[PDB]
């Protein structure tokens, strides 16, 4: 088992709305949960977009999840990662 490296990035403000992307990388096995929370609670999957869990060419995997958030509300959001019975949480930077 290799634990994921989790990283949160944010795009520029489109129309007062930021896109936040939570990336998990360099993990094994392939089974992972990666999802956005607001005010400590998981969002609906219909408010998010997920990449596939793809190889990185080193015997490990990588994936991502994104959601759109209104400007000034970024501190309410947390990326939740779960892998092999472990979890980690990651707030929105800047």
């Amino acid at each position, epitope marked *: 088992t290799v634990p994921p490296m989790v990283n949160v990035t944010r795009s520029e403000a489109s129309e007062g709305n930021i896109t936040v992307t939570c990336r998990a990388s360099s993990f094994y096995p392939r089974n992972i949960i990666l999802t956005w929370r607001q005010d400590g609670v*998981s969002l609906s999957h219909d408010t998010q977009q997920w990449g596939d869990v793809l190889p990185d060419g080193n015997g490990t995997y990588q994936t991502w999840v994104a959601t759109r958030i209104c400007r000034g509300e970024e501190q309410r959001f*947390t990326c939740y990662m779960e892998h092999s019975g472990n*979890h980690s949480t990651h*707030p929105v930077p800047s």
Partner: antibody
Framework: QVQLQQSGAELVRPGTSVKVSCKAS????????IEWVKQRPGQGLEWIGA????????NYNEKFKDKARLTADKSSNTAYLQFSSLTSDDSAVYFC??????????WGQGATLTVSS | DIQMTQSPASLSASVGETVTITCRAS??????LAWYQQKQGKSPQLLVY???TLADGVPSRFSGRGSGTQYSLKINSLQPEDFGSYFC?????????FGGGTKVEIKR
């Protein structure tokens, strides 16, 4: 309405194990992460770890990885913190808390753990 | 690991005075900081989150300010119910870390 009610004071022997509880009410138990915190008078507040009561998946402070075990029983809305190989260093007040949007709220009343022969 | 440096460790003030408690983080915590009150080691009570947002039910005399690595809690017109302990906590990275606390005692 939201309440985290912990178990009472514990008087326990060195070398033994003990499990203290945190019973949640007034909200959907599986939706929020439960947090555990240690407090002593000498060396301040320390975060032990978090658990997702929906899946049981844990996020430990590396310092408590050998000492602490976090579990949750979602049928009784109760989270647990178990200590192994108790020493005098474990004598402290232990709090549970609730993870909101990137801050803690709804701290339990605390449970005192006293290790003694 | 973010180290939180809270000063001063103790503070003597009278009713009506204004007091300020500072917390300095070892790295940028992006305003993910909360302040809590604690009386006699009892349940911590949330005062301020996201560095400056005052929590529900908290008197407007409490004021949180800061960004980056520099944060402060100000108590304007200190009341008898404000004597006790205060601590900051950061939520930018795990493990979550706490300031060493400030005991606010009655000056005489």
């Amino acid at each position: 309405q939201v309440q985290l009610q912990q178990s009472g004071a514990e008087l326990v022997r060195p070398g033994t194990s003990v499990k203290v509880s945190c019973k949640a009410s007034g909200y959907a138990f599986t939706n929020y992460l439960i947090e555990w915190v240690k407090q002593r008078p000498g060396q301040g507040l320390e975060w032990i770890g978090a658990i997702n009561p929906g899946s049981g998946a844990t996020n430990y402070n590396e310092k408590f990885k050998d000492k602490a075990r976090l579990t949750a029983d979602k049928s009784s809305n109760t989270a647990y913190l178990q200590f192994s190989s108790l020493t005098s260093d474990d004598s402290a007040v232990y709090f549970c808390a609730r993870f909101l949007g990137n801050y803690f709220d709804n701290w339990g009343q605390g449970a005192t753990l006293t290790v003694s022969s | 690991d973010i180290q939180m440096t809270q000063s001063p460790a103790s503070l003597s003030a009278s009713v009506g005075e204004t007091v300020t408690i500072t917390c300095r983080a070892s790295g940028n915590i992006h305003s993910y900081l909360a302040w809590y009150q604690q009386k006699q080691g009892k349940s911590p009570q949330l005062l301020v989150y996201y560095a400056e947002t005052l929590a529900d039910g908290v008197p407007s005399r409490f004021s949180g300010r800061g960004s980056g690595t520099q944060y402060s809690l100000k108590i304007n017109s200190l009341q008898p119910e404000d004597f006790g302990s205060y601590f900051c906590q950061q939520f930018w990275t795990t493990p979550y870390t706490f300031g060493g606390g400030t005991k606010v005692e009655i000056k005489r």
